[PDB]
Design a protein around this ligand. Structure first.
Ligand SMILES: Nc1ncnc2c1ncn2[C@@H]1O[C@H](COP(=O)(O)OP(=O)(O)OP(=O)(O)O)[C@@H](O)[C@H]1O
Lengths: 334, 567
């Protein structure tokens, strides 16, 4: 009962069976389900010669509603995924609990954060967006340079921060804006805007049929008194991000340039909120993520085109009532 | 023989040593030595191809009568190749043996070292050039052509009842006055059954290039230890009975030991530093027991690997289990064998030889030699040759082919060794870059069968696989790779092809042919086999090498040529 993997793990329908074990909580919301599903085990170091170490990292973000269930989405991640720590918004001043090393004070206890304390894993945030700007400063390298570097003690040593990042914040403006622009929805400074990722949002409008469907599901959920189990896929992802080490090959990597141009030409000063050369490479992260969801190690148009599917949906998500830019632009792509 | 003909060799000469080979350099540096010994100045040559050869002779448009080429010859009736040859002395000594007969005959400008237990091709000239059908070398009934041409009195002569020779049967008509042509073609074609058995179905190699040369210089009283080692290098190249055959291994255990052991110039005083006369021992073709740890070099050879299947994990599991029975430590399995402690690194092979009898490997141990220069370290039998092949370094400087040749021949001295370790290093990195592609291509399922063979093609250029030696090596690691584990026992026996990109040369899509499994003596079809499609459609093909098993095409003019070459 160990080939539990390879009695099943190679079917074509298993693109979506992973979604059924994210959080068995929500009727809707396939998108973030799939996004966290891929990003829980995706990753590649691909250290080229002496330059740098690229990423075992991503920052998916959902800036939704103050009270749509978001903070519950996070916990099953921890209850399956191998590492963590719990932290909520309003952490330290981002310094952390800068010591000088003496046998006075009996060693003047020592640490610098928690990405120092949990690398190549997770450690949790909730309800961030109403926190000290003096932390939104501080965490703003470890995400991408994946490197720490300190001073201001008896020492200037340095240490490794290879991680990813939880998101869990809260919007401003009451609940959530219309399709009117996003930079107006929550106001974070210019040199933080740099990185960005899996852009989803719990925008709400009322359907009574769906209200009936899910509410049946809810009361059914409240009616349990006394495809995948959590019994297994835990180990699938241990295996998947530990042992197999995927790749890429030239198949269609020029198409990426036309779509980046589709950003820059359809989006200049309307929506295109400095989404530089990190999210593009996050394209690759999705593709490599997909093939490790397959234990493939290479791929054809499939995985990359799935990345294009999801991104095409999202960037239509976060526009104006004029909401169909890449939609009209990609019926030919689609 | 040339205990008589060598006494011709005093005048001027040209010593050419045809396209890159380890037979070549080993066979030639000895003769460079020999020839600055009897006070002769001469010419050694790099060969880039048959055209390189022909321009080379063109640049040497003198009357150097003692012309010499070695390890070549089967290209033409080479008087047709080399017209201005009038009575010029050539010497052939090639082991590419399936050679033309017009080069053998015409006892003018050639050396028929015809010595073989195959008396099978005697009239092979007695009917193709000696007979003919529907020919012009003849007379007519008119009085204007009343002169007797080169009357062979055969089919080479007329077919109109004018043949004074050809006295086996009737004259005027057998069944008709031109049944001459009938029987001519009868013998012609019924024995092209055997002519086409030659040169148009299969090719091979024969014997040494330079062990005969050792016996030549042995009769002049030279006990050059180093010459034993150089010839050893020349043989241990294609001693690889899977690559190209030795055969005589268990007979040369008498031959060469008898050359060298019986004449013991010092039986009691040899415990000295410099060049303490060569020894012999039974060891492996494990790659590089010596200067590396086990666990990387237990992993890049094919034969050790394919039988135990390590490019997947499970091979490593059973591997560790046999290190277990061996009881090697893993640290010790990751320090250089010499860098190990003593007793383990003494008893290593002592145990491995007998308790690998029982676990899936039988064919790793060999018989070979090794020796010291001094106290630095104890060089190995082949770690020259696997350092050599890494010197075919086709850099874009345009000088590095011939320069690397000249470097290589300047390597096997006892002097130049700072480069020899360089060759080792270069070799290793390439050797595990070999492995680096097999996992990629196997488990991407790139094994294109496409009918009667297996087939590979690749996409861009590697400096490994710019040139074709590395390419044949690729093909000859994957093949065992795939055919171990993806098959039943029926289809393990079919041949293999492989593309070879040359982004350097404007797009040519190089290829190399190679053979199915475990048939040592039953060798290549591909002495000609590719040329079928060359006839059928025929597109810009080349056969430039005296090596047969190779071509060079355009980037993209192959696939339809392949579809023709299905059969
Ligand atoms: N599909 C669902 N299944 C179960 N509970 C749901 C679902 N959708 C909404 N909820 C409920 O909505 C509530 C949302 O509050 P929660 O504890 O998630 O704080 P939050 O929504 O993260 O708010 P904030 O982050 O703004 O503090 C939860 O109690 C959750 O049970």
């Amino acid at each position: 009962d160990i080939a539990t993997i390879q009695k099943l793990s190679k079917d074509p329908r298993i693109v979506e069976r992973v979604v059924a074990s994210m959080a068995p909580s929500i009727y809707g919301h396939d998108y973030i389900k799939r996004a966290l599903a891929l990003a829980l085990f995706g990753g590649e170091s691909k250290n080229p010669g002496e330059k740098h170490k690229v990423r075992g990292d991503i920052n998916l973000l959902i800036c939704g509603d103050p009270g749509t269930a978001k903070s519950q989405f996070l916990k099953y991640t921890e209850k399956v995924a191998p590492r963590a720590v719990f932290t909520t918004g309003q952490g330290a001043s981002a310094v952390g609990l800068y010591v000088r090393r003496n046998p006075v004070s009996r060693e003047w206890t020592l640490e610098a954060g928690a990405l120092v304390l949990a690398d190549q894993g997770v450690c949790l945030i909730d309800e961030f967006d109403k926190m000290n700007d003096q932390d939104r400063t501080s965490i703003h390298e470890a995400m991408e340079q994946q490197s720490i570097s300190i001073s201001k003690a008896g020492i200037v040593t340095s240490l490794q921060a290879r991680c990813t990042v939880i998101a869990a914040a809260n919007p401003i403006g009451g609940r959530y804006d219309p399709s009117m622009t996003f930079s107006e929805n929550v106001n974070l400074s210019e040199p933080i805007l740099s990185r960005f990722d899996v852009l989803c949002v719990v925008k709400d409008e009322f359907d009574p049929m769906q209200d009936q469907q899910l509410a049946k599901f809810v009361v059914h959920s409240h009616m349990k008194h006394h495809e995948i189990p959590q019994d297994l896929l835990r180990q699938y992802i241990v295996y998947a991000k530990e042992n197999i080490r995927p790749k890429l090959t030239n198949i269609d990597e020029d198409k990426i340039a036309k779509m980046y141009a589709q950003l820059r030409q359809e989006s200049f000063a309307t929506g295109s909120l400095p989404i530089t050369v990190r999210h593009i490479e996050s394209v690759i992260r999705m593709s490599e993520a997909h093939a490790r969801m397959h234990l493939r190690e290479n791929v054809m148009e499939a995985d990359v085109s799935m990345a294009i599917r999801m991104m095409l949906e999202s960037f239509i998500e976060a526009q104006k009532f004029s909401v169909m830019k890449k939609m009209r632009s990609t019926f030919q792509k689609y | 023989l040339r205990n008589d003909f060598y006494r011709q060799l005093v005048g001027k000469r040209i010593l050419i040593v045809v396209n890159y080979d380890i037979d070549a350099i080993c066979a030639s540096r000895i003769l460079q030595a020999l020839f600055k010994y009897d006070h002769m100045l001469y010419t050694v040559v790099p060969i880039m191809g048959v055209t390189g050869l022909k321009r080379a002779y063109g640049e040497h448009q003198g009357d150097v009568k003692y012309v010499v080429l070695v390890n070549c010859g089967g290209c033409v009736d080479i008087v047709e190749l080399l017209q201005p040859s009038d009575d010029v002395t050539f010497f052939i000594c090639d082991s590419h043996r399936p050679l033309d007969v017009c080069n053998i005959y015409s006892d003018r400008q050639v050396c028929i070292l015809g010595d073989a237990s195959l008396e099978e091709n005697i009239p092979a000239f007695e009917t193709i050039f000696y007979d003919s059908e529907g020919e012009d070398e003849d007379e007519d009934e008119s009085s204007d052509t009343e002169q007797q041409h080169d009357d062979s009195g055969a089919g080479e002569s007329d077919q109109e009842d004018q043949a004074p020779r050809s006295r086996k049967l009737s004259r005027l008509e057998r069944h008709e006055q031109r049944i001459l042509k009938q029987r001519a073609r009868r013998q012609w074609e019924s024995e092209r059954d055997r002519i086409m058995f030659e040169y148009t179905q299969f090719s091979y190699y024969g014997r040494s290039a330079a062990l005969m040369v050792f016996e030549l210089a042995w009769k002049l009283s030279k006990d050059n230890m180093d010459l034993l080692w150089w010839a050893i290098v020349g043989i241990t190249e294609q001693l690889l009975l899977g690559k190209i055959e030795s055969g005589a291994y268990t007979l040369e255990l008498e031959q060469i030991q008898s050359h060298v052991s019986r004449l013991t110039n010092k039986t009691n005083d040899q415990n000295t530093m410099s060049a303490s006369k060569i020894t012999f021992e039974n060891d492996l073709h494990l790659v590089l027991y010596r200067h590396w740890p086990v666990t990387e070099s237990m992993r890049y050879s094919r034969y050790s690997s394919c039988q135990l299947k390590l490019w997947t994990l499970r091979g490593e599991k059973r591997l560790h289990e046999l290190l277990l029975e061996m009881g090697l430590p893993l640290v010790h399995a990751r320090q250089t064998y010499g860098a190990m402690d003593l007793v383990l690194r003494k008893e290593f092979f002592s145990m491995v030889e007998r308790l690998a009898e029982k676990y899936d490997i039988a064919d790793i141990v060999y018989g070979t030699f090794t020796l010291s220069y001094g106290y630095r370290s104890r060089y190995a039998a082949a770690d020259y040759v696997y350092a050599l092949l890494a010197i075919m370094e086709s850099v874009k400087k345009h000088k590095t082919p011939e320069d690397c040749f000249l470097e290589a021949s300047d390597a096997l001295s006892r002097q130049h060794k700072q480069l020899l370790s360089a060759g080792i290093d270069q070799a290793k990195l390439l050797h595990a870059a070999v492995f680096r592609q097999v996992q990629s291509s196997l488990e991407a399922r790139q094994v294109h069968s496409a009918g009667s063979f297996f087939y590979y093609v690749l996409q861009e250029e590697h400096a490994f696989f710019s040139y074709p030696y590395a390419l044949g090596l690729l093909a000859r690691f994957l093949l065992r790779g795939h055919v171990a584990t993806s098959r039943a026992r029926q289809a393990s026996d079919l041949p293999l092809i492989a593309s070879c990109p040359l982004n350097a040369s404007e797009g040519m899509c190089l290829l190399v042919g190679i053979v199915p499994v475990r048939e040592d003596s039953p060798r290549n079809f591909f002495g000609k086999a590719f040329e079928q499609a060359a006839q059928k459609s025929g597109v810009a093909l080349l056969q430039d090498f005296f090596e047969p098993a190779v071509v060079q095409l355009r980037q993209s003019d192959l696939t339809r040529f392949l579809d023709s070459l299905t059969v």
